[PDB]
Design a protein around this ligand. Sequence first.
Ligand SMILES: CCCCCCCC(=O)O
Ligand SMILES: CCCCCCCC(=O)O
Ligand SMILES: CCCCCCCC(=O)O
Ligand SMILES: CCCCCCCC(=O)O
Ligand SMILES: CCCCCCCC(=O)O
Length: 582
Amino acid sequence: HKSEVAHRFKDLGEENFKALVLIAFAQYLQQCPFEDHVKLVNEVTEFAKTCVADESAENCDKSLHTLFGDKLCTVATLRETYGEMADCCAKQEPERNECFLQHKDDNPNLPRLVRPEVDVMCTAFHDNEETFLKKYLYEIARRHPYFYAPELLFFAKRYKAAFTECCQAADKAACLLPKLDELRDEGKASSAKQRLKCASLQKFGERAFKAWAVARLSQRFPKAEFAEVSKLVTDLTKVHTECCHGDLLECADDRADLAKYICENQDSISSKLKECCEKPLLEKSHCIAEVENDEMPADLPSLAADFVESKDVCKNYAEAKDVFLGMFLYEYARRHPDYSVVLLLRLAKTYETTLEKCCAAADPHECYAKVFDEFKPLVEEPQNLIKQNCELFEQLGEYKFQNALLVRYTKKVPQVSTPTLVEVSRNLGKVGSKCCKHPEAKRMPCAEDYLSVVLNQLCVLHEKTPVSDRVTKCCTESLVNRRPCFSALEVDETYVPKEFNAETFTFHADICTLSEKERQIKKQTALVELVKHKPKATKEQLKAVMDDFAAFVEKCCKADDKETCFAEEGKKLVAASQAALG
Ligand SMILES: CCCCCCCC(=O)O
Ligand SMILES: CCCCCCCC(=O)O
Ligand SMILES: CCCCCCCC(=O)O
Ligand SMILES: CCCCCCCC(=O)O
Ligand SMILES: CCCCCCCC(=O)O
């Protein structure tokens, strides 16, 4: 009351307050030294302490955004570091924060993190343990500006536990890398997942996220009531709205309240929350967000009884057009847990469109009576796509599956930059190794919910530099229909060939001097360049040049001495390929 910062300090505490302010500062001013961020956080914490000690102190009743902006731009006073940012904080709330959000670089030009030796890492750990953990938050926060802040506090705790457990014992080297690598891959998957949730609130509105939350939570929490699911959805939407507009202090405070409420009303929500609700505060919310789907309630009546066979459907729709569709989404999702969340949203939109033109055109009960008949093609379209791709995946392997997707997606949109095409196809091919081994029931909720994340990552890296018109049309037209739009484009008859570049196929030594993961990009980039060279003459039989590439690589890999072999066989191979018109 009368002091939001004091209330946040009292709720979160001292350790979480200082960590949640460092993340906020690092996610805004990405190209800034660590020491300045530490000083700013210390000043903010001291001001919060002074306002806590005496309520009627110097002015501290203003909102957190005002203090955030004042400490942000009225103290740093850097203009050359961030362009067009000097005039950013000339407006008032809430226009200042909106201007600040648009300057967050999704892919900043920062050096890749390199891990020192274990001995040096744990020598620095047990020298400034408080400061050593603060640097971990800074780098992750500045490299992922949209990373979920309350989830970043869990990762720091796991980092501290991993460092404490291993190198205060024998075999320091082979204890830390296995566990640190788990965090790195777990942190890159929870940052791309939040980006999809965070770009669906500021591009498609709050109503888009509410329907997603209703569909997802009804699947995870069946046998509950619509009143409870609505409350959970409202709380979740309020939580995720604040983390997207920079209110990290309030976002982490509201998440704890939601977790506490879920644990309190455990019997009325789900029976699988017994274990997740006996964990520490930072682990309860993580466990709840990933709890498994509860068992379906027994003897559920058919949905056709009160949605298509009753002469009040359009009357109820006209009474309230946003809760009637909420009930349909809730009832159709609880009894169909094998559908992806984006499919259920598609069927809900189809049902809404059918109802729109039925009660406003002559007899109503003549065109929405068979609305369930047109759900079949929508259901069968992605079931006939996962089935073929998983079969194709388990006949070529991971590396050859990524190449197959890379060639397919290069002909569809042959204008995106080669690094973006290579990166998206590498992530596209990793859904085969992820959950093509699941049973047919669980294949759909996993595959499409990951394809959505990958395609959103494709869209956000294309908005800054829009080069392809087809990508723009599929990205900024509908969130749910993003995947069907991409898997509906034929080969592009436009995009006259990129001509021939001699320097492209000039593999000179290296290749066989470093690890295998990053040498694959050296060949996938060449494949992308080859496909763009001949977009039309891209039949399957002329793509046998991959075998020649592999043979040429192997011949000089086993004969690394006299590195002129690389150039000689490279020019011979490119001449042979050009002579074959392929
Ligand atoms: C990767 C290590 C997992 C440990 C979880 C956190 C334990 C603690 O710090 O209390
Ligand atoms: C895209 C689905 C539209 C109908 C569901 C409405 C539920 C909600 O908005 O909370
Ligand atoms: C119950 C507390 C946890 C919910 C907030 C985060 C869930 C999500 O990532 O969607
Ligand atoms: C248990 C209350 C402490 C608040 C968060 C600190 C991490 C944790 O132990 O969950
Ligand atoms: C289980 C699906 C494997 C990858 C699908 C991507 C292909 C496409 O979008 O056309």
